[PDB]
Amino acid sequence: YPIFAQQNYENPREATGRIVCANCHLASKPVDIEVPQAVLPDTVFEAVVKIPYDMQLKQVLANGKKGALNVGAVLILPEGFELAPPDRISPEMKEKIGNLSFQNYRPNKKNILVIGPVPGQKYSEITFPILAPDPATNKDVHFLKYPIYVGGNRGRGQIYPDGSKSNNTVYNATAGGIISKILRKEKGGYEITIVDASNERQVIDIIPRGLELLVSEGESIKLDQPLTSNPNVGGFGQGDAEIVLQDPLR
Numbered sequence: 619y620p621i622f623a624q625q626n627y628e629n630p631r632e633a634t635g636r637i638v639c640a641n642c643h644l645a646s647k648p649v650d651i652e653v654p655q656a657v658l659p660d661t662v663f664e665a666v667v668k669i670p671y672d673m674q675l676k677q678v679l680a681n682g683k684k685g686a687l688n689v690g691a692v693l694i695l696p697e698g699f700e701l702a703p704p705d706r707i708s709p710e711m712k713e714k715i716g717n718l719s720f721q722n723y724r725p726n727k728k729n730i731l732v733i734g735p736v737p738g739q740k741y742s743e744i745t746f747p748i749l750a751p752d753p754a755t756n757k758d759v760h761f762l763k764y765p766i767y768v769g770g771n772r773g774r775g776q777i778y779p780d781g782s783k784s785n786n787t788v789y790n791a792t793a794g795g796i797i798s799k800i801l802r803k804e805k806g807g808y809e810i811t812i813v814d815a816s817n818e819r820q821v822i823d824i825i826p827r828g829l830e831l832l833v834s835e836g837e838s839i840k841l842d843q844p845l846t847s848n849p850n851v852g853g854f855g856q857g858d859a860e861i862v863l864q865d866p867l868r
């Protein structure tokens with residue numbers, strides 16, 4: 619979630635340009651961002667973010683059942699740019715945007731906006747209403763080309779803030795060996811007993827409900843080998859753009 623990033627990372631963009639969601643949302647899926655080529659001072663413009671995915675997809679939910687995907691994004695503007703207040707947004711723009719509640723990444727960070735989780739069904743495309751600053755009013759702003767960066771996600775992540783895996787990821791063998799037993803649990807999930815003859819050790823690998831098993835009793839496996847297919851149907855992607863803060867004189 620955006621909140622996880624907000625809580626654990628001071629800045630959502632790393633020195634390499636990687637956006638922090640990628641630390642937990644491990645698969646890569648496209649994202650696109652559209653903005654005008656140029657914008658005049660103190661005027662509102664739209665930053666249109668696309669986080670596309672096959673709407674027929676159903677993902678494994680926390681409970682082990684399959685369900686719909688939700689989407690979310692973090693938009694990083696230059697200092698001085700902000701979310702447009704309601705009094706500056708046209709009623710048309712208003713309805714184009716929809717019922718979205720944009721938030722500042724942190725109260726002191728007005729140039730970084732987050733949104734989500736919200737249903738992918740409705741928000742595969744999200745319009746951020748942005749208010750351009752004014753070089754005439756702000757000394758740290760100028761008539762320049764400015765970069766804009768976005769990170770957009772669809773689907774449950776693979777790792778929690780505490781570093782533990784979620785059920786939306788692949789489960790790998792914790793020991794190489796031969797599978798001596800596979801216990802199918804009543805409400806789903808399994809217990810896989812592995813005998814690592816080489817190290818003379820027995821280990822039991824637990825599989826969460828909702829994943830598809832790839833192994834059978836009597837099968838030999840290696841350490842780290844996948845015991846399940848990767849259930850993840852979602853993904854995180856990044857995009858960038860450049861906008862000219864145009865001199866009204868030109």
Ligand code: HEM
Nearest residue numbers: 619620622623639642687688689690735773774775777779
């Ligand atoms: C980065 C700013 C970031 C974004 C964007 C993001 C989005 C996001 C969405 C929209 C959801 C819901 C998905 C669904 O279909 O329901 C979601 C869920 C999870 N996230 Fe996330 N998330 C961002 C950041 C982070 C970070 C930094 C972590 C790891 C610390 C993380 C992890 C997760 C996990 C796990 C989930 C699933 C929770 C659950 O259903 O059990 N995200 N994220």
